[PDB]
């Protein structure tokens, strides 16, 4: 009973110094326990580790972990979790994997720690490191949460890495979770800027003739219209018309937006289809900022200017 009474008073100051991030005070308390005869435990070095972590110091935390391991006591799961979080914040993916292997040889479950590692690596802007760590974990046999899948896919598609996004999608579908319209739209966001209008159309046909959860949305039609419109190899004008005809699904939430009208006007302008271009520009006028969206920063030939020139040349000056 007396040993518990002493351990209470000692651990009180230990945890207080740990929560106020005084590593020197924690070492003093540990040496005080050593002198008073109270042998340290996995809970004592936990305070030292978290005190080193809260001060964004990694070498001190590694020294504390090595001291705890030399003490003959198995480290707690919280200590390894904090070390993994610190390594993910800094960006040391290899040391994080070493910590994960150290947890695995100690029979600890490494799923939650691996998820925290990949999440911190994504947050720390180390996207490729998080991707390769996730691939290693998937090859190992571990599973991931849906939020991790969505975050990885979205970040890889925003960066422009379609390969890792497709690999993560394949691993997700292998793990039992099917893909929804969000993942397909994220993939098409990268597939449209390739320059080949047939790689996006394959995904569009996969979505269209698939299940209800993976059915296309307005963003999908917009991406495929952008892919077909900005081609550089062939005509691709009847393709846009057939895609617009397929886009005619009133009671399927498939309604046009500003991007749809802008892309349709641009396409019909580039191919001298002035009547349908005016038809869609009349709809684009109703949205606020639609002409600004049509002028897509001037990167693609100023489609608004091309529309104005097409109106001027034929003589339809009232529409001008």
């Amino acid at each position: 009973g007396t040993e518990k009474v002493l351990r209470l008073v000692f651990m009180e100051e230990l945890m207080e110094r740990a929560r106020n991030a005084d590593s020197k005070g924690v070492s003093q308390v540990i040496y005080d326990m050593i002198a008073a005869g109270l042998s340290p435990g996995p809970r004592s070095f936990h305070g030292f580790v978290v005190s080193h972590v809260l001060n964004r110091d990694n070498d001190g935390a590694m020294h504390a972990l090595r001291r705890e391991l030399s003490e003959g006591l198995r480290p707690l799961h919280e200590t390894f979790l904090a070390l993994v979080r610190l390594f993910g914040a800094k960006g040391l993916a290899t040391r994080g994997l070493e910590i994960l292997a150290a947890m695995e040889k100690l029979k600890y479950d490494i799923r939650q720690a691996w998820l925290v590692l990949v999440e911190e690596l994504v947050r720390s802007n180390h996207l490729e490191d998080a991707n390769k760590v996730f691939l290693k974990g998937a090859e190992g046999g571990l599973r991931a949460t849906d939020e991790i899948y969505d975050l990885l896919i979205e970040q890889d598609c925003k960066v422009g890495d379609h390969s890792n996004a497709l690999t993560i999608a394949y691993e997700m579908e292998a793990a039992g979770r099917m893909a929804t319209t969000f993942h397909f739209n994220c993939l098409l966001s990268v597939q449209a800027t390739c320059g080949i209008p047939e790689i996006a159309f394959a995904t569009f046909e996969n979505m269209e003739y698939g299940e209800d959860h993976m059915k296309p949305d307005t963003e999908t039609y917009n991406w495929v219209i952008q892919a077909y419109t900005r081609a550089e190899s062939y005509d691709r004008v009847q393709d846009v018309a057939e895609l617009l005809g397929m886009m005619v699904e009133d009671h399927k939430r498939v309604q046009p937006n500003v991007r749809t009208y802008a892309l349709l006007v641009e396409c019909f302008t580039k191919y001298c289809v002035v009547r349908e271009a005016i038809r869609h520009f009349r709809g684009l006028k109703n949205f606020e900022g639609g002409t600004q969206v049509l002028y897509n920063d001037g990167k693609y030939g100023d489609p608004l200017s091309l529309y104005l020139r097409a109106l001027c040349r034929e003589g339809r000056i009232v529409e001008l």
């Binding site: 207080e16 978290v50 799961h77 979790l81 100690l106 949460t145």
Partner: protein
């Protein structure tokens, strides 16, 4: 003679297996043993961890009763002829809420329908006395439940059953309907059999894939467990329901084959639908209004719980035997206990001690709320060896809840002790 859970029971009648066998039901590696609680399935062969699942039961579709879930009522075991008013009774029901009524009507008609497997299978079904469902329970049992919500819900379900019987089975009804359930007790027993032995699975016959509620023979004789050894898979080519052992699990001779009903439900739903309660239920919720909050991470650490909040298991590899205090009860406690997690801030011993003492006070209050103790309930249980199954289920539910509260108190005490090491 090694002591095994199968050895304590007695083997079942040869006929029970035979009626299924002549109709193509096949069982591989399992034995049916009857007992005081009822029939159960046990293993008769040592199975090492397998790469893939092994089929212990193959149950054809022609021995089952199946009703579709959605509005178009499709009976693939089509035993109801066209124009029969039993279909008029079945269709005159709400599609979403009440599904046991249609299954009860179908079971009654199958009992009436000639050359049907259920006519022979009904003899092995539990009788009104053997049934443990709370639909066949007196007001004394509902009062002994000591829970007003559950008693009220069961009374409301009994009232619904009586009202449905009085509406559909009126005097002017044809004789073919009247012979189905002449007395309301027969309809209540049919509803009990439907509720306590219903399986919700997705089945594919031909080109149609649908979800339906089915009454499958020889698959309802498997008891309930939260760590199952088998699961109900469907085979569309042979149009049979197959029970397969989980892959990577080792089954030894004498073990009891078990399946999971309602994975993730409290003991209230179990006691409501199947009339059963388990003290090791990992999904039980205890409503604590105390402002105190324990630390979740340190709790799972001291009790060696690993995994995400959606999947909790005791890592017995780190456990190195010893601690057997850990079970589904402490998992349900950690799930229901108020917890706080703020990054990597370390817990304070004084605050956690105040929290656990407040939690112990609240738990003692809640235990004093019930006008009984664990010892009194156990003594009442052992005092009555032969009695109504409903009263035994009620006192067992009370004892299980009291033991859960006591184990929560003990786990909080062990946490307070081990946190200071």
């Amino acid at each position: 003679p090694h002591d095994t859970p199968a050895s304590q029971l007695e083997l079942a009648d040869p006929d029970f297996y035979k009626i299924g066998y002549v109709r193509s039901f096949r069982a591989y590696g399992i034995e049916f043993r009857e007992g005081p609680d009822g029939y159960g399935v046990f293993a008769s062969r040592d199975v090492e961890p397998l790469r893939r699942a092994r089929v212990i039961m193959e149950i054809p579709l022609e021995l089952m009763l199946t009703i579709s879930k959605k509005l178009p009522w499709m009976f693939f075991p089509d035993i109801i002829p066209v124009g029969h008013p039993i279909f008029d009774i079945i269709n005159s029901t709400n599609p979403e809420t009440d599904s046991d009524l249609r299954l009860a009507c179908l079971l009654l008609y199958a009992f009436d329908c000639k050359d049907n497997f259920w006519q022979l299978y009904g003899d092995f079904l539990p009788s009104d006395d053997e049934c443990t469902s709370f639909l066949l329970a007196t007001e004394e049992d509902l009062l002994e439940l000591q829970d007003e919500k559950l008693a009220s819900t069961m009374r409301e379900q009994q009232q619904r059953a009586l009202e449905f019987w009085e509406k559909n089975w009126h005097s002017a009804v044809p004789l073919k309907i009247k012979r189905l359930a002449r007395d309301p007790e027969r309809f209540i027993w049919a509803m009990c059999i439907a509720q306590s032995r219903s399986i919700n699975l997705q089945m594919r016959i031909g080109a149609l894939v649908q979800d339906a509620n089915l009454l499958v023979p020889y698959a309802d004789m498997m008891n309930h467990s939260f760590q199952p050894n088998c699961f109900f898979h469907w085979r569309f080519k042979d149009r049979m329901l197959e029970v397969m052992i989980n892959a990577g699990q080792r089954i030894r001779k004498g073990d009891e084959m078990t399946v999971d009903y309602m994975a993730g439900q409290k003991n209230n739903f179990f006691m409501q639908r199947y009339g059963f309660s388990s003290p090791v239920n990992p999904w039980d919720v205890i409503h604590f209004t105390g402002d105190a909050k324990i630390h979740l991470d340190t709790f799972l650490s001291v009790f060696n719980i690993s995994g995400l909040p959606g999947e909790y298991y005791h890592n017995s590899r780190l456990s190195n035997d010893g601690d057997s205090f850990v079970d589904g009860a402490i998992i349900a406690a950690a799930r229901t206990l108020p917890t706080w997690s703020d990054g990597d801030l370390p817990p304070i011993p004084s605050l956690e001690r105040k929290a656990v003492k407040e939690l112990q006070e609240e738990c003692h209050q809640m235990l004093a709320e019930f006008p009984t103790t664990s010892d009194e309930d156990q003594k009442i249980l052992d005092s009555m060896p032969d009695c109504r199954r409903t009263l035994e289920a009620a006192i067992k539910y009370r004892l299980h809840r009291k033991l859960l509260i006591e184990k929560v108190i003990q786990a909080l005490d062990i946490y307070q002790d081990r946190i200071l090491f």
